[PDB]
Symmetry: T
């Protein structure tokens, strides 16, 4: 019934920031899209974004405590943070990792994630629709 | 309007084969599910499966020639075949790579794909619904 | 009671092909030897050989379905095929990997197998008698 | 007097397929060019192409049995197949490996071949004329 | 006519020690089994065990001097000792390496041996029957 | 119309030096062969050899300035010199890398070149005829 | 006389979070245990916890300025943060690194720490008693 | 006309902290030096420092939005943060990376930066004068 | 009630041997310290030392048979011996690995242990008090 | 008072050579710029360039003997020459390494230098102004 | 005045053992040669050999205690034993490592020694005369 | 009867240059020492030194042609030059590699040589007496 969508560092900047890699849709538009899709799906989407690891960690804890599912695009922390991994590891509800870009078509260091192994599954390279697809999965 | 769904080695065996990793849905059921979802979406799905690399290659060529999109779960060849990669590289329409299992939660060699970099995007670990999500993306 | 002996690529060529590495016994002789040893042991040996991965995969599936044991010398695919590995992984009956040559005394890439980890056990460097020893194990 | 030219996966697609990397000459044209050059050189060229590993293996065996030289462009299998390597290893006549593209100017995985070490020699990046040069070598 | 069976560190402990990996057969039983199989085969088996590298080395020297074959399960020294390798390298008679466990299905460091390359051949994962099979090979 | 053939360190020694790897043809003979082939082809060949990196660099610069093609066998510097690579990178005309020996059949460090990636193409293992083939390519 | 105990990310969650790896003792209990042990030992323990790197860094600076010893369990930052390492490097008083879990029995990336080399020493796998042992060391 | 100087973790501690590696100049002195040099150069320098990644990210965003140049010494995050890299990647104005210490003369992990590749250029090992030199570049 | 303290190679030499790395306390003093601490704790400590792997192995076996806990400082064998690892793996009672020196602040090869993963926990860099702390843990 | 500026292989070619990577300023212009900046700074600049390693080595020796500072752009030898490193290691006066290009934004092999560790500091990617900045540092 | 010559595993076997790699001189002859050379040089040579690590360690300790120089050929333990390294590290007098064979011309694992770094120096590939040369050095 | 002693880059600088690593003996003294030792030994020593690779190569060729033995200290080229290796490979007479310093006790890149494998043997870390010992070997 409730899904948390959690966005990491530089996802606020989405919109203006390198549109050839990430698109012209802004973060607020993205929230709007998600919130609408959720309505259609009978879910409530709680979308949050922070460039702060500790803030992301808190949101994850809360979802762990609530046993609520999470959609997580952690940005660059995907490739770097064990701390994040360890928080997500406490989640009982499903975890879907999302990347807007096809990381596998970019720098070699982006081809590794600490999160993927403890994710339920992972969507990449489908743009912002990856979020929406991730929703729909959880709907089933 | 037309999508090719292409399944590689051991995907016929889907159903009976290690259900804790891959599920109880059989390949024919999977075709049935996909074909239905496509109808709902206004697409026609052409689903094919082969344990033969040369057969997969032929199907890919055909899609390249037709400029039709492809959903591809290549099984083990994902991690091994350059040949496959090179065929898919000729595709003008989108290519979505799908894995039923979360490969990132398994043997370390499964965490690399030759296909991912030339894919449009990639879905893993969402079971057979990954196919259906992949459809819906293409629908937009 | 029934054992499948399965031989991969270039094992037909056994006989004529580099005898200092692999010997002067031909494939038909090998079938003859195995079939005889099986009789002595009260087993029936079904020996097959193909240079085609898809054909090998089919034979493996069949053994999985029949819950029959397999002796497998996959040739070069031992070092390359995940697909093969994944088929063998479905086997409930024992799987013995056999190499005629001592791969550990040759090129460094031959010292890795995708099959060994899911094999019950592995015999190498004992020539064609490795097959016969593998039989006898299964006899117990 | 007789040379086998053997072309692997996706070489049929030569012509239409990424011409900036591989050119506008089609496979049939290539056969035509080779067959003509052979006439000028007093050789007979037998050019074959398959996307099937087992088919390539059979052609190689045949050349081994005939002690005929081979020109081999194995496509992607160059980087992946031990099986192929092992067949070519049986050749008594010379083996020239040919790549149309300069593999050393592309993805890092293309910079390794299993075939090069057992080749007599190797031509890359000279386009389809590499075949013709390979012929002429054998002519001496 | 005479075979040396040589067992390295922690093989005395065989029996009581992790039976899910190594079995319930004790070392004395193993000697008994081997000694019996040898009688059936017309051989005499000399089975020895030590947790001392220098003791193993002495036994190997003796076999080198006697030009007698050796069956060797060196335990953990398989993965660590060059010294052992160098002694075995002096053997003129055959050397069969045996492991009870399928090392290839365990920790990654067990997948390398210093002995395998100078072995005639290697049996692993067939339990204590690997010894008996190794005998029978030598019988031919 | 004009081609530069440029030979690096120890290519003077060609003739006397390890003939099983490099042949009995001497450097002067090689110049003679090339100069003749060029005449037949309507080209003029300027063949030079030096064991001095700075000398090779100067010859390369000159060819860059003249926009003349180069055939380059850099000897051991192929595997070691970035400096050389950087000079060749300035060439507008084609660059063919030639090795007499099949480097891929020798020490593992010879299997890498700094030059190959900026070469037009590369011939190896065809002996001194590799030079002549390289000429003929440039002729087209 | 005064010791700082510093706990990093997800150590608040200690208690509820994967108890098979980390235990049923909560963070407040841990503070209580430490504070008591300190009393027995004549020390004062200042225990702090934050999921914020910058907060941890500030606490470390303060201890550096005060020349007070630190017990530090940095959680996931142990494996990732150079920044943390650099702060701890300023400490004149001793630094004991503590992990509750035996990191060496878990994922391979946990087997490296940036902190260990600049630590005085390190305790792992002794649960929350590791803290108490670390205290007692400092007491001497 | 305006330059942002951005200093990461532990750069406040500059002054007191390991002076043999980093010097006796404090952060405030550094601001003073920079601010003065800027006046001489006709620029305005905005120097900021934070041990918080999210704070650094915000400052970078702001500079991206303002199309203002940045001088960045990210401290330890240089070696660890992709997130930072991704923010800096949005900068249209130049980016100069500065390290006070010669990182190449220290621990091996310091010899890699995620920032260097997207920097315009990089100064290291020139102490705090590196900042001043970086200014002067931007002045041209 | 009974603890085995087991010391490997060169721990007799403790005292005289490089005191800047290991201290001025001799092995006999160490036994004395441990034996006293044990009395205070109500335990009996059996401390043994050998430079012989086979001797250490025997002591470990004995503890396995007795289901007695072990404190083990294996010296250099920590980094080299699988054999030792395999013996310790049979222990049902706890195993604490102790190093006097902070191995993580020394040569890179010391930063790996074969024992750590099968240890209950590990203390390093706390000098000879590490033994005493290890005792006290076992006391609880 | 006197500074040596030392330029390695292919730096003469600066000007004409790939201007998108290195610029349109020629070497003589560069000398002119440096010589002028030195005058302004009260220094005398001795700028030399050679494609010969032995020549560079001689210039370095001379500076070592004179205890004069050096600015060194060694070109490709930066990544390859230990010999150069060893000469520079004899310098008592400061050594500044300069690269015109941002090597960290190019081929992966350019991201390592043998010189950086024994340099005082290093400037890269600031074009030919890097030389001038390097001067000014030495002026202080 | 006194030198210890210490020989490790399989050096007794010297003489009979692979003479193409190690020669026809036996160990007793070697002692005889050394003892004679020592007389000529005014030294006394104490030559010992053991296949036992603990025995070698004891001899090393004794030399450390006596502050006597050591010539050490440790055989295979050179590549494997940290324990040995640690004993030799206690030596105040010089340590010369000797290998009869040129290890650098053999298996790749022989090209590393744990002893070389703490040796004064190392002689390899000069046969048994390496011992004699090592003596003479110590004589000065 | 005649030996060539060949010294590479920076060996002229021997004497003045880092004496803690290389000593206070100058190159001329070294020639003097060698020339004297040769007289005592009945040999004639031809000692040459160059910082030029091409010059060293010429001297090596000459020795190959003369079938004269060589003592070679190539300095930094030891670790970098294949070209040198290839020249030395032509030598029929023995080749002794000498390093003054114990390279194995220094930077990790010094622990590899291209020359060692084709050397007869190698002396390191015995200072300039290594030359003299190398002479004496050749004397036998
Ligand atoms: C948001 C994106 C990033 O910030 C990148 O660091 C990451 O590699 C890919 C990313 O997570 C994305 O494609 O959504
Ligand atoms: C079908 C699956 C396989 O066959 C595996 O080889 C592969 O690693 C994962 C897989 O593609 C899947 O999860 O769908
Ligand atoms: C049959 C053999 C091969 O084809 C090789 O590729 C393989 O490395 C070893 C082999 O499986 C064998 O030794 O039987
Ligand atoms: C035919 C080409 C391929 O298919 C690629 O896979 C291969 O890397 C290069 C190739 O063999 C070629 O350049 O001819
Ligand atoms: C006896 C076993 C061991 O001691 C392990 O160290 C080794 O990895 C495997 C072993 O040799 C066996 O499976 O027999
Ligand atoms: C001339 C040859 C050499 O000098 C070797 O160093 C090189 O690896 C191969 C070579 O370039 C050749 O085969 O022509
Ligand atoms: C607190 C734990 C963690 O958060 C993990 O990331 C770390 O690998 C181990 C840990 O520090 C612990 O075992 O206390
Ligand atoms: C400020 C310094 C650091 O904090 C270190 O982590 C870094 O490796 C180097 C540094 O950025 C510096 O030399 O200025
Ligand atoms: C006793 C020490 C050694 O012998 C070293 O080999 C080892 O690396 C560390 C050691 O175990 C210790 O610090 O106690
Ligand atoms: C002069 C340039 C080169 O020659 C390149 O080899 C080197 O990688 C970078 C260079 O030193 C430069 O950017 O100045
Ligand atoms: C005695 C020899 C050996 O035992 C080998 O293990 C070693 O690699 C080389 C050796 O030390 C030697 O060449 O003397
Ligand atoms: C002469 C020395 C050098 O120049 C170093 O480059 C080399 O690593 C060691 C050296 O060859 C020596 O120790 O004689």
């Amino acid at each position: 019934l409730i899904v948390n969508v959690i966005n990491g560092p530089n996802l606020g900047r989405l919109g203006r920031r390198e549109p050839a890699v990430y698109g012209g849709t802004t973060h607020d538009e993205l929230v709007a899209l998600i919130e609408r899709e959720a309505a259609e799906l009978g879910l409530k989407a709680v979308v949050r974004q922070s460039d702060s690891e500790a803030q992301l960690l808190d949101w994850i804890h809360q979802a762990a405590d609530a046993a609520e599912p999470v959609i997580l695009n952690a940005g660059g922390l995907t490739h770097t943070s064990v701390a994040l991994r360890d928080a997500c590891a406490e989640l009982s509800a499903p975890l879907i990792e999302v990347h807007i870009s096809n990381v596998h078509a970019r720098e070699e260091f982006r081809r590794h994630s600490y999160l993927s192994p403890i994710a339920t599954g992972v969507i990449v390279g489908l743009g912002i629709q990856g979020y929406l697809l991730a929703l729909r999965y959880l709907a089933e």
